Amino acid sequence: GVFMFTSESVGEGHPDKICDQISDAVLDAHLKQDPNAKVACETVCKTGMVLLCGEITSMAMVDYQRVVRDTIKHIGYDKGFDFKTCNVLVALEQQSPNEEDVGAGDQGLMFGYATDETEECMPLTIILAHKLNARMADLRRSGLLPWLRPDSKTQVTVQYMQDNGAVIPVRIHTIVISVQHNEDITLEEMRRALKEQVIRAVVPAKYLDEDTVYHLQPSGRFDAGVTGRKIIVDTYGGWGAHGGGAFSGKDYTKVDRSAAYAARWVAKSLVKAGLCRRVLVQVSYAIGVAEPLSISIFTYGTSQKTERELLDVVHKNFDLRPGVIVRDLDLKKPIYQKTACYGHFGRSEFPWEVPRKLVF
Amino acid sequence: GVFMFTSESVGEGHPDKICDQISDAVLDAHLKQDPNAKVACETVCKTGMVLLCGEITSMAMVDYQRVVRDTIKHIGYDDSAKGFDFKTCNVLVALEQQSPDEEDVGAGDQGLMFGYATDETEECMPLTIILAHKLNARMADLRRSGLLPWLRPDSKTQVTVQYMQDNGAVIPVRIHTIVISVQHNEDITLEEMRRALKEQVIRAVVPAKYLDEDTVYHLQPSGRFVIDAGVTGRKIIVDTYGGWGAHGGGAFSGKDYTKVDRSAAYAARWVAKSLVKAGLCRRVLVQVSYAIGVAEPLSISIFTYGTSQKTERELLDVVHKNFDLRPGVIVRDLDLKKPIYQKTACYGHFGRSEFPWEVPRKLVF
């Protein structure tokens, strides 16, 4: 069985991603001063205008204009947009103010996914898509490709072989890249650079061949942004499943974030321990109940051990009550801005990406 | 194994769904006058302010103010008391509309889509998302009939079903939890509202055999809800399978049929449902992938979760012989130039037998 699979990633300059990142920059700014901060921050933007909405309970003193403007500058708008001159409108309302046995705040359903097909225990499609966009960002920021601007979209299609439930990447079928740019640069120059400096640098040569299709700046030369609208890009690029919960601008008290991270942590640990090549972990929560209602492990036929055996391993090695997760994954730390682009999963610098040694 | 699964739906007055529904009303407005209109209409809304963004190529002459206001009125926001009113709200139209000047037309995007189906309900949809949707529709019915005139348009439901595995199929055993929050008038109490939600909404919609004395009810759980930011394309899971199957990422509303993310998502549903109704499997995830400027799918994968006697390859054979999933032919088979998109924008795009993608095709095999 040969199939093709496509995942997408968007650049830091994509308006939906501007909002995710700004929202998590505000979350971090509070956590730097007050780890017990509660933060629900929704960003909206529309060309020359950024609007922060939501609710905050915190003892931190956060200079919101500085945070937002610093984040816009960091993204690279200094292009249709500028940190020195854009309208930042801060609407959010800051009020002032068991432990491990506090019940879930929502009736949550979350999936965790891992695959052995990459070092990062992630689908090749989504990793390559995120890395291509990061490569462009690196080349733009360093001044090496000065014509690059921060908005971009990349799609990578990988042609796969099935292997009794596992999936083997065989070749790159198609890569699509569009990126915003300055005027003094040709179509041919941009395409040459994208092929040579971005794609060749990111994609293992063994996957590239003479039939790989390249759509580079496909519509020749180059809307509203909101927080929490790039949920497939943020997670597994179409692989596994998604319960619907967005991440950015939600603090650790939101099971949609904290338990999604933990679900990933479990799945990644199961693959790393050699108990399966591929796994979908499904964990459901009841409002006001600490203990999850259920945990389901699906190995796609790639485990010697049974589901129930794996479940017993999960119980022995993990405590997925929200309060314990926050502790074990150190989730009151100001680390969320970094998660808001290039995917929340696959990057080893996050604690949910450091596999737990399993005793079984 | 026993497991619990939760799906969410939101009512017509939830701000994200107000936007989806406005975006698709714009689409329909255009398609009534120009069957070939290209529409990419994004709606934003925040406290008395609706903003239409995006790009339309069309011959249609559309009164945007009227279409937006008719939609808001139809949703049921008709007075300042509700925090929103079709008369007094500002509809800020930012669209740039331009004017213009085959079965083997190429897909406009490098796209991946999933279709999913299951024998657990008559609609071939997961019970969790179907109940969630029907609970919201029931409230909307009782609000419009006058039977519960305290009801207002905005709402959110969650249904947790307890399931049993069955050789890859899933059998619903019971309703574990129901969460309902619905907007309301001032002169009704929480206690009356809860009773009515139990007796007139839940008992009417959810089959008696799934409810028991242990079923948990969280009805108006955050207390009162008398009176917020919305956009198009942020209820992608609510719109589809409610956590089940999988999702490639493509939002539907505000997009004409030439976006494969919409048209092939509907065909993929159609195929999945057709396979289950033919008796070929009890449960199926269909995955279809397209390449820009190529008509034919690159691949079609079919996972039956161990519920088919036929193999993947054999089921692929059946799909090849019964379906033509090129974008141009999809739109012909599913009548996708017809202006019925506003109807898809709440209560889910899948499960409702009034849509062509929900009428199974009789399969030769």
Residue numbers in the entry:
A (entry chain A): 16 to 93, 97 to 115, 126 to 250, 258 to 395
B (entry chain B): 16 to 116, 127 to 252, 258 to 395
What's the paper's own text on this?
MAT enzymes (EC 2.5.1.6) catalyse the formation of S-adenosyl-l-methionine (SAMe) from methionine (Met) and adenosine triphosphate (ATP). MATα1 is a liver-specific enzyme that is mainly found in mature hepato­cytes, while MATα2 is expressed in extrahepatic tissues including kidney, brain and heart and also in developing liver cells. SAMe is the principal methyl donor in the transmethylation processes of important cellular biomolecules, including DNA, RNA, proteins, neurotransmitters etc..
We report the first crystal structure of human apo MATα1, which was solved at 2.3 Å resolution, revealing a tetrameric assembly. The crystal belonged to space group C2, with 45% solvent content. Each MATα1 subunit consists of 395 residues, within which there are three major regions that are invisible in the electron-density maps of all subunits (chains A–D). The first region is the N-terminal region Met1–Glu15, which has been found to be missing in most reported MAT structures owing to its flexibility. The second region is the gating-loop region, Asp116–Glu127, which has also been found to be flexible in the E. coli MAT (eMAT), rat liver MAT (rMAT) and human MATα1/MATα2 structures. The last invisible region is the Phe250–Ala259 domain, which contains methionine-binding sites located at the dimer interface. In the central region of the wild-type MATα1 dimer the MAT subunits interact through polar contacts, creating a salt bridge between Arg264 of one subunit and Glu57 of the other. Structural comparison of the active-site residues of the SAMe-bound structure and the present apo structure of MATα1 revealed an overall root-mean-square deviation (r.m.s.d.) of 0.687 Å.
